[PDB]
């Protein structure tokens, strides 16, 4: 009965195009207006050929006229099935050089959905299982759409490519930007090199079936191919109109190619990340890319088209009860809100007062106004810096850390309260995206553990054997997901070689106002500074058994070795950049006894009588006096070299840290490597700076005030090794990038009792070691046996506490 399927005019079941009677009849035309609102084609079908409008083409001149059913070959004519395929195990046609790359979003896809429902994403599932996936992918802070999205495709921050967020305003263009419609579209607000353009540059075609930007022209210029974006066009259409690309001519076949879907954003905003209607989206999405999957089947290429599956974002339940409403913190709320889990705070009167209002009086009357209030204020710069969310003037000063599943808004006829959002803190699992990949170049059946999405450039650009534009990603971390990596890393070069800081006598007069009244033999105490070879190389490899940091930074320091820690003085800070010192499990001791290094120029050094009476610093001490044996071993601590101004509340938490916190944290993973040093960052772009930069000192003094201070802790991910013993592989890393501040309001305790404050504080101010490597600029574990693309991945890597 073919002719014609919701037809006119022309035994039962071929008519009609009812004009219906009780019967039409059934049979034979239900598995047919499936052609028309059906991407897929049945059996009743099978070897049928064009109808006069049509989605997708069963049959029979279909394999040559480049239009038929992604399921046609197998579900008319019968071949192995993508989905019903085993895992095995093989190239590209000829009319294809290189191995093409697509870049697949499914917009608010959070790695939860992944670990949970895989069962019901039949092709997520196969792909995965035979793919490389990651267990979760890392999102940029905030997390949004087009944040997210551009970062993905340029490898930048928000604060470099400018797109912070969907709603800002920059007061230098006095300009305002809205995922709402126009002027969204003006270059001026887009920074960087999107991939596409990365792709034109050096002599590839890139299209683009929706991506943020895409239909911006960035830098003068659009992707060889994009797409006016409109939500409403089918899923389906998208992956068929892609796969055509793939068709065309090899010298206008597109290379770079990207697929982009709203689901399960849209549905997860409107019933929550946890609900049934997000499954089905779900169920939508893993059919979106089945298709793409089996037209990698019905051409040839399934195996060699690279493909990346991943989302920008997470989705969080939401509610309008769990609300904090800027009118219980203002009797008078006269500001602009973006309003959000990532909210921020301005003046309403731009251009003119946007520098003049203030933002730390909105801060400090946002602060600690509640007992348990469900956010944190910060400026920009005090935030944490594992967010790179400071240096660019539409990053506000005001900004709000929202707890996870509330909202903070303005008053109380806030709406968008139901269902779910994002936009939180990069850290929380509920944000985290999926990663997932597939082709030659992927190794298959392999899972690698959580990287961030800034990395996700390079490896494109490494797959499509570009070179890659300046970006936050560290290329060749992600060597590890690649049969053949494009691209070797190369250790950095030290810039600034070790210079000597000598032995010499005590000084006479000693002016440096120091006193220590235990020593009875002073030259032999400070013989103890004075190191044999061999002390040294004993003290050389358990206190830097890494390797010691390069310096990158031109800086004058030298090398100070003691038995029990080593330190790399700076005459231009002061103070030691760097300090290391090994504890092993296990393992009232301060300031009483100080005393000048006689290895210091003295004009070099700060002194006892530099941090006089009415301070609100003291010297801190970097190797702890806390850790050595009296009483020789705590002389080697006890003297000008190892200190550091400190602001007297944070001294509290470091000492609760020395005291307290680390030698739990050594016997729990059997002793660790400790590296600690300051940053100074007042310029705030993540980085080490000039030190013509220094804007604060003590007072009365040239000694410079750390914007932050940094510990490095370092043990084996095996408890029965030491961090002596550990083989590269397997090393445990803790880093924290500790802000330095005159008082603790952050943990709105400038009050007792030390306990669980700190160990809080400190949880949200984890990083990478890339980050402290960026801020003081050294090199870490320099001798590491072991391919460095793997170090790479040690210092990518980010801690996260379950609020532990
Ligand atoms: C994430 O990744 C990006 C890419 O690496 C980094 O962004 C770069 O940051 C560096 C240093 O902050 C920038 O280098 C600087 O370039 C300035 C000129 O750049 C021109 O072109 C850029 C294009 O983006 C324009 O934005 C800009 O307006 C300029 O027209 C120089 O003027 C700077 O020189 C300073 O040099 C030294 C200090 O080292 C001093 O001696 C000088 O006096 C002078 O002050 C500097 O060289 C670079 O431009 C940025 N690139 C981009 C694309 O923005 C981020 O730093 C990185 N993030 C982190 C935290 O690592
Ligand atoms: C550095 O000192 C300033 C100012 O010190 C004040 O004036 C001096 C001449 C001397 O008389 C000191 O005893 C005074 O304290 C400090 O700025 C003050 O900080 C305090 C508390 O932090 C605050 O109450 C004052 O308003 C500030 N300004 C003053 C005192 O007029 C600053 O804190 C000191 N910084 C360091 C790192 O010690
Ligand atoms: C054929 O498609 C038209 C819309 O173009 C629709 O109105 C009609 O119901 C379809 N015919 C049948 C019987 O499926
Ligand atoms: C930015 O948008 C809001 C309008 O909702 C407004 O407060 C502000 O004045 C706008 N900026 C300008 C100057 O257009
Ligand atoms: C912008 O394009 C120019 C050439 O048109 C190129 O030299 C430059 O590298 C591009 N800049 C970015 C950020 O892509
Ligand atoms: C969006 O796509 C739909 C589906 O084809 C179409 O009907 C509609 O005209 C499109 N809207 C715009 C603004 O182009
Ligand atoms: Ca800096
Ligand atoms: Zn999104
Ligand atoms: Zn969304």
Same mark, same amino acid.
């Given at each position: ?61 279909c ?16 071949? !192995? ?9 093989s ?18 896809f ?16 196969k ?72 792709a034109?540059?050096?002599g ?5 079936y ?19 974006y409109?939500?409403? !066009? /089918? ?30 954003? !849209? ?36 195996n060699?088209? $690279? ?28 500001? &602009? ?25 909105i ?20 935030? /944490?810096?594992?967010?790179h ?21 303005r ?21 985290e ?5 597939h ?17 996700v ?13 300046? $970006? ?9 997901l ?25 000084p ?25 070879d061999?002390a ?57 006894c ?12 700060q ?8 301070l ?8 702890? /006096?806390?850790?050595?044996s ?6 080697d601590?006890l003297?000008?070299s ?34 600690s ?10 980085? &080490? ?8 000192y003590?007072?009365? !003094? ?20 030491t ?18 501040? /005159? ?62």
């Open positions: 009965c073919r002719n014609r399927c919701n037809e006119t005019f022309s035994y039962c079941s071929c008519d009609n195009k009812c004009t219906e009677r009780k019967a039409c009849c059934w049979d034979y035309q239900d598995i047919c207006v499936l052609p028309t609102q059906s991407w897929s084609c049945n059996k009743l079908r099978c070897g049928e050929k064009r109808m006069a409008n049509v989605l997708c083409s069963c049959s029979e001149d394999l040559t006229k480049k239009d038929c059913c992604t399921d046609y070959k197998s579900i008319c004519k019968r071949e !192995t099935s993508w989905l019903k395929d085993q895992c095995a195990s190239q590209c046609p000829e009319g294809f050089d290189q191995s093409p790359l697509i870049l697949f979003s499914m917009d608010g959070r790695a939860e959905y992944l670990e949970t429902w895989d069962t019901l994403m039949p092709n997520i599932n792909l995965k299982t035979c793919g490389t996936h990651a267990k979760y992918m890392r999102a940029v802070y905030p997390t949004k759409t087009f944040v997210n999205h551009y970062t993905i495709v340029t490898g930048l921050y928000a604060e470099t490519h400018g797109i912070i967020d969907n709603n800002m305003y920059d007061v230098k263009l006095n300009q305002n930007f809205s995922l709402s419609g126009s002027n969204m579209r003006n270059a001026a607000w887009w920074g960087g090199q999107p991939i596409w353009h990365t034109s540059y050096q590839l075609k890139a299209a683009t929706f991506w943020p930007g895409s239909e911006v022209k960035i830098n003068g210029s659009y992707p060889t191919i994009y797409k006016v409109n939500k409403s !066009t /089918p899923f389906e259409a998208r992956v068929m109109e892609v796969l055509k690309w793939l068709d065309l001519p090899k010298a206008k076949r597109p290379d770079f190619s990207t697929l982009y879907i709203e689901e399960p954003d !849209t549905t997860g905003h409107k019933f929550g990340p946890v609900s049934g209607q997000v499954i089905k989206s779900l169920q939508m999405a893993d059919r979106t890319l089945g298709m793409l999957m089996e037209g990698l089947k019905q051409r040839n290429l399934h060699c088209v $690279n493909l990346i599956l991943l989302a920008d974002h997470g989705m969080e339940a939401i509610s309008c009860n769990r609300l904090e409403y800027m009118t219980d913190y203002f009797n008078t709320v006269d500001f &602009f809100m973006y309003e959000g889990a990532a909210p921020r705070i301005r003046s309403k009167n731009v251009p003119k007062d946007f520098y003049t209002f203030d933002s730390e009086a801060v400090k009357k946002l602060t600690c106004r509640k007992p348990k209030q469900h956010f944190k204020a910060y400026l920009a710069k005090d935030l /944490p810096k594992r967010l969310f400071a240096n660019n003037i539409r990053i506000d000063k005001v900004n709000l850390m929202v707890d996870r599943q509330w909202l903070a808004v008053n109380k006829k806030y709406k968008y309260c139901s269902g779910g959002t994002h936009g939180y803190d990069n850290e929380f699992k509920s944000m995206a999926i990663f997932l990949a082709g030659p170049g992927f190794k298959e059946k392999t899972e690698v553990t959580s990287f961030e999405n800034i990395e450039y390079n490896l494109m650009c490494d797959l499509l054997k570009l070179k890659p534009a300046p $970006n936050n990603g560290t290329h060749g971390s992600l060597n590890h690649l049969k053949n990596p494009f691209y070797n890393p190369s250790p950095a070069k030290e810039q600034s070689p070790p210079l000597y800081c000598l032995f010499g006598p005590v006479s007069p000693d002016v440096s106002g120091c006193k220590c009244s235990s020593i009875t033999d002073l030259e032999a105490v400070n013989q103890r500074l004075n190191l044999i061999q040294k190389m004993q003290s050389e490899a358990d206190n830097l058994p890494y390797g010691r940091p390069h310096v990158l930074q031109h800086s004058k320091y030298c090398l100070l070795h003691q038995t029990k820690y080593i330190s790399a003085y700076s005459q231009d800070i002061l103070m030691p950049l760097w300090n290391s010192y090994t504890i092993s499990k296990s393992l009232p001791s301060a300031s009483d100080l005393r000048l290094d006689v290895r210091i120029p003295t004009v070099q050094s002194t006892c009588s530099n941090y006089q009476p009415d609100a610093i003291t010297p801190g001490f970097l190797y702890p /006096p806390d850790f050595s009296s009483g020789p071993e705590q002389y601590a003297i000008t190892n200190i550091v101004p400190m602001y007297k509340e944070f001294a509290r938490l470091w000492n609760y840290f020395h005291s307290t916190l680390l030698p739990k944290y050594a016997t729990e993973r059997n002793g660790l490597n400790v590296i040093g300051p940053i100074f960052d007042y310029n705030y772009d993540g980085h &080490f700076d000039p030190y013509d930069t220094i804007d604060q003590v007072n009365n !003094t040239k000694i410079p005030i750390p914007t932050h201070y940094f510990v490095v802790l370092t043990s084996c991910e095996n408890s029965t090794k961090p002596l013993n550990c083989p590269p592989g397997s090393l445990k890393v803790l880093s924290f990038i500790l802000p330095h501040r /005159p008082d603790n309001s952050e943990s709105c305790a400038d009050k007792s009792p030390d306990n669980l404050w700190v160990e809080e504080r400190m949880q949200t101010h984890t990083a990478r070691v890339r980050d402290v490597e960026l801020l003081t600029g050294l090199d870490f574990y320099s001798a590491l046996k072991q391919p460095l693309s793997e170090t790479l991945r040690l210092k990518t890597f980010l801690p996260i506490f379950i609020n532990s």
